[PDB]
């Protein structure tokens, strides 16, 4: 009588789906994997780069049932997407586990659709925690595994031995594109905090604490006579910030997050860079070589394919009090300069119907006519723009 993973897998294998998507940019096709979070509503979490520039999203289950899925919320800063299955009919979602209790050396199982082969299961171990640096601006607190992960596992599940999801396989470090035994996956708590925001708002309430910092290396540790060789080094605190209200001075070293020690500042940025606005948390500091704890509460930071879904390079929100849809800042060569948009443009109308906000703006995006007429302004000048 042999030990096996099959008893656990037969419970969890239905929860993992494969995701087939067709889009355009020049038409293309690609595929990744997804995981059912709410079997009732039809929520499937996946990587945002699996679903980037997506016109049609199809989800195929373990048994081969084809479905349809519409986007919900995306967060490319942490490469977590969330979609909802059109017509949820008799599914089974996966339960999740607390990644903050993960330890290096625990056994892991990867489930995904590598190369469109179908649902493939592969075993490994936790190689390391708190891994980052592979894209400095992204909120990455990855888990490392030697479990086999390749093209198509993207968005797939990484579970423990009790069948509980601990991570979403995101990307690999393969010099040739084939798994050399190094895979990265986004922890569960990060995916839980991000998805649970996307259900309410369809977006991420990006809260900030108001501190500046850099990685504490052993060299800087000696510089400031600080014993901890790793953590967050506070450079400055911003005025009116909750961090200032909490009484954090520059030169303090952060060592723990709600008790949980910190693997790096980059891990800390991703950890609280996902907690929803208002999330009360505590910190383990270290000033003058003396340990200090402090209670905190995240506040607001106040900041196009978020709305356009395909035409990006320019961030845009509401303007003032019922002043329309302003454009914050634009990048060149992107699909935003393909239509005639610059920084400061304010979309006031569209097709003879005014636009007071993004909810009034998308209220005409729903109409989907053959031709679009954006009644924007630049300065005191009122112009129109045509597309499709």
């Amino acid at each position: 009588q042999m030990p096996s993973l099959a008893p656990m897998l037969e419970k969890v294998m239905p929860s993992v789906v494969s995701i087939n998507v067709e889009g355009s940019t020049q038409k293309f096709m690609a595929l990744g994997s997804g995981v059912i979070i709410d079997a009732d509503k039809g929520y499937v979490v996946t990587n945002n780069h699996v679903v980037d520039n997506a016109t049609v999203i199809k989800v195929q289950l373990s048994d081969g049932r084809k479905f349809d899925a519409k986007m919900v919320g995306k967060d490319p800063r942490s490469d977590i997407a969330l979609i909802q299955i059109q017509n949820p009919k008799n599914l089974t979602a996966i339960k999740m586990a607390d990644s903050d209790a993960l330890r290096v050396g625990d056994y892991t199982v990867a489930i995904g659709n590598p190369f469109g082969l179908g649902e493939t299961v592969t075993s490994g171990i936790v190689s390391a925690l708190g891994r980052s640096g592979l894209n400095a601006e992204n909120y990455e607190n990855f888990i490392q595994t030697d479990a086999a992960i390749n093209r198509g596992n993207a968005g797939g599940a990484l579970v423990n031995l009790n069948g509980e999801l601990i991570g979403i396989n995101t990307a690999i470090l393969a010099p040739d594109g084939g798994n050399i035994g190094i895979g990265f996956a986004i922890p569960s708590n990060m995916v839980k905090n991000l998805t649970s925001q996307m259900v309410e708002y369809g977006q991420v309430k990006r809260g900030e604490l108001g501190i500046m910092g850099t990685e504490l290396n052993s060299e800087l540790a000696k510089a400031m006579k600080v014993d901890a060789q790793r953590g967050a080094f506070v450079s400055q605190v911003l005025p009116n910030s909750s961090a200032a209200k909490a009484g954090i001075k520059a030169g303090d070293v952060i060592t723990s997050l709600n008790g949980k020690p910190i693997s790096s500042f980059a891990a800390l940025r991703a950890q609280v860079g996902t907690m929803p606005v208002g999330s009360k948390l505590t910190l383990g500091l270290l000033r003058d070589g003396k340990q200090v704890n402090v209670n905190l509460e995240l506040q607001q930071s106040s900041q196009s394919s978020s709305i356009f879904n395909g035409i990006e390079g320019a961030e845009m929100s509401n303007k003032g009090k019922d002043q329309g849809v302003v454009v914050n800042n634009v990048k060149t060569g992107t699909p935003a300069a393909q239509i005639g948009l610059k920084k400061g443009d304010v979309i006031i109308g569209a097709n003879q119907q005014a636009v007071k906000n993004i909810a009034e703006l998308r209220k005409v995006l729903d109409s989907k006519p053959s031709v679009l007429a954006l009644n924007i302004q630049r300065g005191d000048s009122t112009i129109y723009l045509l597309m499709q």
Binding site: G32, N47, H49, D79, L134, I149, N150, R151, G152, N153, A154, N169, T170, A171, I172, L173, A174, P175, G177
Partner: peptide, 5 residues
């Protein structure tokens, strides 16, 4: 040396 599957 990197790949986002």
């Amino acid at each position: 040396c990197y790949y986002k599957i």
